[PDB]
From Swiss-Prot, chain A:
Gene name tied to this protein: SRR
Name of the protein this chain belongs to: Serine racemase
Family: Belongs to the serine/threonine dehydratase family.
Binding site residues for Ca(2+) 2: T73
Annotated positions binding pyridoxal 5'-phosphate: N78, N146, G177, G178, G179, G180, M181, S305
Residues reported to bind Mn(2+): E202, A206, D208
InterPro entries, sorted: Ser/Thr_deHydtase_PyrdxlP-BS, TrpB-like_PALP, TrpB-like_PALP_sf
Catalysed reactions listed for this entry: L-serine = D-serine; D-serine = pyruvate + NH4(+); L-serine = pyruvate + NH4(+)
Tissue expression: Expressed in the cerebellum, hippocampus, dorsolateral prefrontal cortex, and in motor neurons and glial cells of the lumbar spinal cord (at protein level). Increased in the dorsolateral prefrontal cortex of schizophrenic patients (at protein level). Brain: expressed at high levels in hippocampus and corpus callosum, intermediate levels in substantia nigra and caudate, and low levels in amygdala, thalamus, and subthalamic nuclei. Expressed in heart, skeletal muscle, kidney, and liver.
Modification after translation: S-nitrosylated, leading to decrease the enzyme activity.
Molecular function via GO: ATP binding; calcium ion binding; D-serine ammonia-lyase activity; glycine binding; identical protein binding; L-serine ammonia-lyase activity; magnesium ion binding; PDZ domain binding
């Protein structure tokens, strides 16, 4: 029915589990107090590469049973970091395509992490043209950060671990950008324990997933959105939308202020260096609209999706 | 390629997981010392109904259609008076539909009494195959029921393979699974599963030498059923492999180890005495296999071996 099924998640779990962390679930008395809920924090900020994206990235690069000869990406962010690590694990080269006009800062980070830089011109046109060429020349693959089925399946493994670590969980709260994580999680939860709610959390400044659920059709952001939640600037896409349409119970939007306040709360009160994008799920459970969630939904697992925060800019 | 796929096994585990137990994997230092290996015991003797067969039976009740024109079974029917009939009855009871067991007139009174106390209805046949088939097809049609074969029905094979999803998840460093074989529904479902997910893991069958059709069939390269009903204390593996399980077993099972009656008996007693688990002798088959001389041919690299303890339905009074 969908671009993945739970069988692809179980395959991904076998495929990646030797090479990723089974990240802990932590709790917070104060957050419980503040929300009225029993909260559980699935700590993907402690995952390899500092976000959950190594799960999709390793699943897409690695074959369970022409294997990729290289990986190529436009991402200098969590996706690119994840793809680079996965490539290194598989013994294959990783290429990041970066504008010539990119920060000098960021160039050095990439090569420190062990990717090879291929400079393009700042045009999207030129980025895509160079990526395609590098891909073809190296016989490599590009991995879509959210729409690739192997990526969506890899992300689903988050929910397998949560359902084992929190056996009486009533809901998962998942930040949504392109929806590969949300959609992998929804597939998994609805397959294994469909009474468990799946909720998305989204910046109201980037509210395409909410708009699409409201309208009943895929409505991507018209323009690049402006949000401190830099990891959820992607719109949902054609492979994640049908899953989220059918298997996600509700979408909670949160303001920029709510994201910032929730992020600071986690830093000061839980001492976890989450990135603001990971504060989106916390802000959702703190939000006014979340009070409409039934009192029967008590045990809520929020995915702290990443910790890759620029402490230089760390309001 | 085969009568089931890994996708069918996952569908089965979604279908049955709210009603079966995720059985534990136990260990024993003593059996580790005796075998040279790192053993893991998948405890299907603690499953609902006392054997793994609830997996295939519940999957069949929740997935098979009686007819082109009716999507929901209105009853279940089988010729198995043993672990399969018990499991099928439980599965039917869960789904609120009646169970019928077709029973020879010649069956012991104790068999007839038990079937009825569990909550199945008995339908009598003549001991003849002709009669058994006639009666079961009659019952199946009259009741708008499904007939559920203990080992060759694809939905049953797919449900038994869920054991291997649990094992792989429970024992991430496992090197081999050892599985007792009779009709091979459990072996073939496990083989499909392990070979789709992590084919580097070996799949080994264990079989009584007194009922060695799966060994003879693998040896000859074609399906060779027992010519006569076998005599073995391993009563749950007296069926021969069949047309749906044989191709899977031929292609995806790495080796077959046969064990004598005395080896089955000694292994069963060893598990009772040294692990304090009430396995039925049939479930002692896989333990005997790993203790057997021929198992020493298994590479020393194959270190972490999970043996399925397939059932605990033992006649305590009879206990040979
Ligand atoms: O620049 C970041 N991190 C460092 C980085 N980014 C890479 C990209 C490719 C390979 C290694 C990398 N190392 C960032 C921005 C948003 C989240 O993380
Ligand atoms: O840009 C990065 N991460 C996302 C981010 N987004 C922010 C928003 C505000 C403050 C800090 C933030 N950090 C990065 C660079 C190097 C490592 O991570
Ligand atoms: O005699 C046995 N079981 C009793 C039984 N058999 C049933 C069949 C249907 C319903 C309930 C049943 N109860 C046996 C033989 C081998 C293992 O167990
Ligand atoms: O006959 C039954 N099971 C198989 C069996 N086979 C044996 C052989 C020796 C000792 C115990 C055994 N038990 C049965 C009836 C009721 C429940 O289980
Ligand atoms: Ca969005
Ligand atoms: Ca046999
Ligand atoms: Mg599609
Ligand atoms: Na950790
Ligand atoms: Na509950
Ligand atoms: Na029919
Ligand atoms: Na599983
Ligand atoms: Na190994
Ligand atoms: Na067939």
């Amino acid at each position: 029915q969908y671009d993945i099924s739970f069988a692809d998640v179980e395959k991904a779990h076998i495929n990646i589990r030797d090479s990723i962390h089974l990240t802990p679930v932590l709790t917070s008395s104060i957050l419980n107090q503040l929300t009225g809920r029993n909260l559980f924090f699935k700590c993907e900020l402690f995952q390899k590469t500092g976000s959950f994206k190594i799960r999709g990235a390793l699943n897409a690069v690695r074959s369970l049973v022409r294997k990729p000869k290289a990986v190529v990406t436009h991402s200098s962010g969590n996706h690119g970091q994840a793809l680079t690590y996965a490539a290194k694990l598989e013994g294959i080269p990783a290429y990041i395509v970066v504008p010539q006009t990119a920060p000098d800062c960021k160039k050095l980070a990439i090569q420190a992490y062990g990717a090879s830089i291929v400079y393009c011109e700042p045009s999207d046109e030129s980025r895509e043209n160079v990526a395609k060429r590098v891909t073809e020349e190296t016989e490599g693959i590009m991995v879509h950060p959210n729409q690739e089925p192997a990526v969506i399946a890899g992300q689903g493994t988050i929910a397998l671990e949560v359902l084992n670590q929190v056996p009486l969980v009533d809901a998962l709260v998942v930040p949504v950008g392109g929806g590969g994580m949300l959609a992998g999680i929804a597939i998994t939860v609805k397959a294994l324990k469909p009474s468990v709610k799946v909720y998305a959390a989204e910046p109201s400044n980037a509210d395409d997933c909410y708009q699409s659920k409201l309208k009943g059709k895929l409505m991507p952001n018209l323009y690049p959105p402006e949000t401190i939640a830099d990891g959820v600037k992607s719109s949902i896409g054609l492979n994640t939308w049908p899953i989220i349409r059918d298997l996600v119970d509700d979408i909670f939007t949160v303001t920029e202020d709510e994201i910032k306040c929730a992020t600071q709360l986690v830093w000061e009160r839980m001492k976890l260096l989450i990135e603001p994008t990971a504060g989106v799920g916390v802000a959702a459970v703190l939000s006014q609209h979340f009070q409409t969630v039934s009192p029967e939904v008590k045990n809520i697992c929020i995915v702290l999706s990443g910790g890759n925060v620029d402490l230089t800019s760390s309001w």
